[PDB]
Paper text:
The hemagglutinin (HA) protein of influenza viruses binds to sialic acid receptors on host cells and is the major target of neutralizing antibodies. In a previous study, we described five naturally occurring human mAbs that potently inhibit the 1918 [name] pandemic influenza virus. One notable difference between these two antibodies, however, is that mAb [name] not only inhibits the 1918 [name] virus, but also 1943 as well as select 1947 and 1977 human [name] viruses. This study provides a detailed characterization of one such antibody, [name], and highlights common, emerging properties of cross-reactive anti-head antibodies.
We also determined crystal structures of the [name] Fab and “avianized” 1918 HA (SC1918 D190E D225G; AV1918) components separately at high resolution (1.45 Å and 1.80 Å resolution, respectively). The availability of these high-resolution models for molecular replacement and as restraints in structure refinement significantly improved the final quality of the lower resolution Fab-HA complex structure. Indeed, the Fab elbow angles vary over 30° between the [name] Fabs resolved in the free Fab structure (215° and 217°) and in the SC1918 complex (185° and 190°).
Numbering used by the authors:
A (entry chain L): 1 to 9, 11 to 27, 27A, 27B, 28 to 95, 95A, 95B, 95C, ...
B (entry chain H): 1 to 52, 52A, 53 to 82, 82A, 82B, 82C, 83 to 100, 100A, ...
The structure:
């Protein structure tokens, strides 16, 4: 509940309807109204929907809000290219430690070119770095569209979360997207496993690359 | 026109302070509750605080309780955020926003309304000028597919941005991709630059990454070759 739950991303083609969900609990969405905000790159958020279903002037009537129980939903009829943005829901929460609670945001892509799976290159630690008593795995992720991926690392077959730093996808010059993820290990950790993998998930498909000690 | 204008952002160290202000015009500021909301680079919105119209009631995000204080001066149509006891994770763009309705109701609570400022960036960091360590990312069978090999340079642990990378002093540009940097928990940046080249050249052609970090007046030229 510290963050209302929204899907990280969504997409649709021009003309389609899309819906974006926002899940909370009885102390927020169950008891208080939900607002939605639209944010374009490098600009402040804009109020899109207030009091669950009302639009400020200057907001197209293809945007609408609804609520049922502890979930709320933003619907966009007839997607247009300018609807590509990040959408946030928010509600007052009257728990102990009352506060405004935002959802985590949903990046909506309005599809304007073909889906493109990421190219992934994974480099192991260099011998020079290992001699500095450090070890960095480098997972480079490029040429994907839409611009949303999740990255998961494995030591052998087990999830690794510690020591991971991943960038937020950024547009390339060709309007596809790039990101990178770095796994920091000790030299000992690196040599004590048979392999490490970087798995990139994009629009439901996974691309995995694996490296092993020399 | 109806607007809010934030000021006061800048670069500061942790365990220090910074004071933000937000100057309202074109609406009756003194009749509205006011919010602060923040957003870390590449991340989501996070509510920081709200203050009632008369300043009598304040509420805060748990993470800033004991550290930040919201206040207002209605005579000056100004909202303040006094950010004491700064921490690195307070790095964000800070927005002020007007409450939705003029008065307070039971089924509404508080929520950011239609008027938002432009944001002011606060960067909290204890890092200081440092040039990068550069490591080769050697080409290998595993970075080779379809007559093209990938190789690169890892530019590690520098501050502040930016770094520039060229290959072979500009003689290699096709297939070069220098990725945006990651900001590590340490407060230092790292990035990688990768080039795709015909596998055919890995013997004859020399590959040198040229790394320039102007902020520290550091320049590194590193040859990247197949392992041994």
């Amino acid at each position: 509940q510290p963050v209302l739950t929204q899907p990280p991303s969504a997409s649709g083609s021009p003309g389609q309807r899309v819906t974006i969900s926002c899940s909370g609990s009885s102390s927020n969405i169950g008891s208080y109204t939900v607002n939605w905000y639209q944010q374009l790159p490098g600009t402040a958020p804009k109020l899109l929907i207030y009091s669950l279903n009302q639009r400020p002037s200057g907001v197209p009537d293809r945007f609408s809000g609804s609520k049922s129980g502890t979930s709320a939903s933003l619907a966009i009829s007839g997607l247009q290219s300018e609807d590509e943005a990040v959408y946030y829901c928010a509600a007052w929460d009257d728990s102990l430690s009352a506060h405004v609670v935002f959802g985590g945001g949903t990046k909506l892509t309005v599809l304007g070119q073909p889906k493109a799976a990421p190219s992934v290159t994974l480099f192991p630690p260099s011998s020079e770095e290992l001699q500095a008593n450090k070890a960095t795995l480098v997972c480079l992720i490029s040429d994907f569209y839409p611009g949303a991926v999740t990255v998961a690392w494995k030591a052998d077959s087990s999830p690794v979360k510690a020591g991971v730093e991943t960038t937020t996808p950024s547009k390339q010059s060709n309007n596809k997207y790039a990101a990178s993820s770095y796994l920091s290990l000790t030299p000992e950790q690196w040599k004590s496993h048979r392999s490490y993998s970087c798995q990139v998930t994009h629009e439901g498909s996974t691309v995995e690359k694996t490296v092993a000690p020399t | 026109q109806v607007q809010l204008v934030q000021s006061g952002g800048g670069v500061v160290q942790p365990r220090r302070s910074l004071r933000l202000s937000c100057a309202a015009s074109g609406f009756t500021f003194s009749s509205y509750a006011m919010h602060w909301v923040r957003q870390a680079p590449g991340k989501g919105l996070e509510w920081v605080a709200v203050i009632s119209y008369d300043g009598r009631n304040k509420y805060y995000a748990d993470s800033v309780k004991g550290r930040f204080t919201v206040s207002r001066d209605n005579s000056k149509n100004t909202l303040y955020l006094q950010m004491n006891s700064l921490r690195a994770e307070d790095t964000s763009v800070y927005y002020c926003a007007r409450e939705l309705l003029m008065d307070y109701y039971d089924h509404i609570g508080y929520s950011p309304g239609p008027t938002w400022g432009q944001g002011t960036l606060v960067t909290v960091s204890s890092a200081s000028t440092k040039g990068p360590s550069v490591f080769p990312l050697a080409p290998s069978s595993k970075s080779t597919s379809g007559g093209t090999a990938a190789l690169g340079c890892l530019v590690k642990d520098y501050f502040p941005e930016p770094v520039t990378v060229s290959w072979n002093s500009g003689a290699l540009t096709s297939g070069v991709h220098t990725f945006p940097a990651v900001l590590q928990s340490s407060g230092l940046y790292s990035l990688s630059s990768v080039v795709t080249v015909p596998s055919s050249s890995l013997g004859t052609q020399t590959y040198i990454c040229n790394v320039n970090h102007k902020p520290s007046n550091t320049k590194v030229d590193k040859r990247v070759e197949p392992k041994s």
